[PDB]
């Protein structure tokens, strides 16, 4: 029984070994604690929006959507239908990006490293859509608490359709590399098994629930934008091991493709932000020709909108699990409190139980199957 | 609705057992993976020959900042300080005073590009299209000091990139 | 892709699927980089009349939360926070993988 320190996302891990086995695993976090929640209290809501891109920097628009939904609930407004459809479209695109990241980096840590490039080409393509729609590849800040910042450029939907019609064979090549491979199975099968009761008690969410046979999904049970107007299936695991969660994430990629097709077909016309110039800024032409519009633009970009007092907890089904925000407003344009709940915190808390009586090399597999990004863990 | 990913029961007849035994003993799935990799070897790579080819961009792309001016040649900035107030990172510092002709103009306009997060809030809070975040992205520096822009640097950037800045604003201003 | 027929046959046999149908490199089939001007319709509250703001203000309709049993101030059947969630259906599109 020797204690060894795997030091410098970036993680420090203190583990005691009895030979090959692991006896106690202790993750030491805080190497990426920037103090985001305290810095939010010194900003307005619009100024506090870009922090959420950096929270979970693999699934940006999902954090944007969760923050926007919380602020909408506190403001007592609702976005226009086209804004909601665009939000769900880009949320599914973001889910595809996150699942590519998770699976490819998991396999890379295992030692495969070829699907990483195969799928990072598609990640680059998806990046172009983000760049085209907003002007930034990763931290777009596109989804706003009133809707979306701007409308789609005239050629975006055709390119999204052309990209999404060839993605299935990319997933298929990934599955050829990984799904039926015996080395991959021996690396992932029967590793990190967690029971349904223990997964539920420990605060797990997302695949960590679904992999254990629990039939739960926030997009189905508690739909938020237009997710009740689209049809998709929810893959459910049977053994609660790493292999089942890998299969679940791949099937989520396929279901995200299905939802993307539906969202492309049913995109409605109309405006993109709530037509209430005391929350969403007016158009540049209106600001430059009208007096109320200029006053409202000035006040919104200097002071911001005042949110009625109250506290909410708004959660969404982010690609990593339940991502929530507990937002407390004292009645001003500056949030009084913003607690950020990320599934990675609970997953890394459960890491210690998840790695009982396993090899040293299996800890890497467990960390990979939890898909821990330390920006959301440390905040 | 929901799906099952791994509740497939393998057949226990002699043919399926023999197929599984042949798979174990002759490594069929490993050779299948080898075939997939071999197939991927014989197709064209996705690499572009930088710096001769450049990755695609859009008029909405936001890179290095610039301060623009009117066609007469007189700077658009009126020291309203809305870009300074909206800046999430507090990366803009502005000081103003009446000019010799009484114009409302800035005597100091600094952007700390090491504090900037390139969100574009400044260029959308500007009522006169004075501050823009242009399409340049190749401005890496050998020292920290040269990434601290002042009014002269931003004005030079505007004069340098005005052609395609105006082209991009023309292409994208109907969505704003 | 400007690949010879023999190389296409070799890659298709090695992969087992027809690669030329759906290529992962983008070609002239993408949309043009220069597009016509848009029009971007206005919102629903862009009316000139019967558009008073007091009738369409969400924020002022927010109210402080309703208090029940302020402690400082019959059969009675038991209740639940919500009706029990009804069981999910088994995806009659591809129930099993």
């Amino acid at each position: 029984n020797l204690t060894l320190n795997f030091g410098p996302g970036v993680l420090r891990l203190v583990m005691e070994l009895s030979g090959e086995m692991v006896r106690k695993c202790d993750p030491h976090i805080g190497l990426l604690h920037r103090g985001t929640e305290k810095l939010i209290e010194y900003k307005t809501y619009l100024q506090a929006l870009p922090y959420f891109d950096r929270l979970d920097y693999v699934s940006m628009m999902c954090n944007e959507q969760a923050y926007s939904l919380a602020v909408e609930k506190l403001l007592n407004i609702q976005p226009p239908p086209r804004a909601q459809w665009i939000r769900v479209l880009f949320g599914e695109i973001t889910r595809l990006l996150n699942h590519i990241m998770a699976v490819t980096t998991h396999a890379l840590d295992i030692g495969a490293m070829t699907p990483f490039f195969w799928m990072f080409e598609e990640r680059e393509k998806m990046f172009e859509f983000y760049e085209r729609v907003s002007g930034a590849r990763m931290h777009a800040a596109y989804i706003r608490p009133g809707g979306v910042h701007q409308d789609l450029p005239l050629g975006l939907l055709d390119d999204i359709y052309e990209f999404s019609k060839n993605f299935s064979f990319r997933i298929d090549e990934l599955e050829e590399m990984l799904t039926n491979n015996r080395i991959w199975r021996n690396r992932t099968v029967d590793i990190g098994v967690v029971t349904a009761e223990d997964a539920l008690n420990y605060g797990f969410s997302g695949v960590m629930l679904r992999g254990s046979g629990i039939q739960w999904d926030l997009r189905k049970t508690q739909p938020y934008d237009v997710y009740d107007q689209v049809e998709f299936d929810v893959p459910i695991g049977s053994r609660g091991d790493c292999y089942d969660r890998y299969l679940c994430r791949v099937e989520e990629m396929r279901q995200s493709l299905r939802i993307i097709s539906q969202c492309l077909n049913k995109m409605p016309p109309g405006e993109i932000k709530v037509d209430d110039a005391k929350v969403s800024p007016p158009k540049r032409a209106e600001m430059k020709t009208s007096m109320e519009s200029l006053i409202h633009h000035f006040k919104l970009y200097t002071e911001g909108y005042q949110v009625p007092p109250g506290a909410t907890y708004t959660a969404i089904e982010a690609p990593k699990g339940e991502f929530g925000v507990y937002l407390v407003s004292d009645g001003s344009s500056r949030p009084y409190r913003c607690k950020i709940k990320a599934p990675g915190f609970a997953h890394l808390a459960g890491l210690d139980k998840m790695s009982k009586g396993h090899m040293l090399a299996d800890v890497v597999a467990i960390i990979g199957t939890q898909d821990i990004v330390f920006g959301e863990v440390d905040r | 609705t929901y799906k099952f990913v791994n509740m497939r029961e393998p057949s226990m007849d002699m043919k399926s057992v023999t197929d599984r035994a042949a798979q174990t003993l002759l490594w069929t799935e490993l050779v299948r993976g080898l075939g997939m990799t071999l197939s991927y070897l014989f197709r064209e790579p996705a690499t572009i020959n930088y710096p001769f080819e450049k990755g695609p961009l859009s008029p909405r792309f936001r890179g290095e900042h610039a301060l623009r001016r009117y066609p007469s040649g007189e700077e658009r900035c009126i020291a309203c300080k809305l870009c300074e107030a909206v800046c999430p990172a507090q990366a803009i510092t502005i000081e103003a005073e009446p000019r010799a002709d009484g114009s409302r103009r800035t005597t100091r306009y600094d952007i700390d590009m090491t504090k900037c997060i390139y969100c574009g809030f400044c260029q959308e809070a500007c009522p006169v299209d004075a501050i823009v975040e242009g399409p340049n992205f190749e401005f890496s520096t050998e020292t920290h000091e040269e990434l601290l822009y002042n009014k002269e640097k931003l004005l030079n950037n505007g004069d340098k990139w005005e052609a395609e800045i105006a082209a991009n604003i023309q292409a994208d201003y109907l969505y704003r | 892709a400007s690949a010879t027929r023999v190389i296409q046959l070799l890659r298709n046999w090695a992969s087992g699927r027809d690669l030329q149908a759906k290529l992962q490199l983008r070609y002239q089939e993408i949309s043009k980089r220069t597009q016509p001007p848009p029009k971007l319709p206005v919102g629903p509250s862009h009316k000139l009349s019967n558009n008073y703001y007091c009738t369409r203000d969400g924020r002022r309709e927010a109210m402080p939360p309703s208090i029940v049993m302020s402690s400082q101030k019959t059969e009675k059947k038991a209740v639940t926070p919500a009706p029990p969630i009804k069981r999910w259906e088994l995806s009659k599109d591809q129930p099993y993988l």
Binding site: D151, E175 | - | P38, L40
Partner: peptide, 29 residues
Amino acid sequence: ASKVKQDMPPPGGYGPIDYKRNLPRRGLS
């Protein structure tokens, strides 16, 4: 004057998109 023009799906919608897993069998006992 001008009529509304924004990004919309074409008339009749887009073509079907394949999403099911496609793992063929080469075939040998």
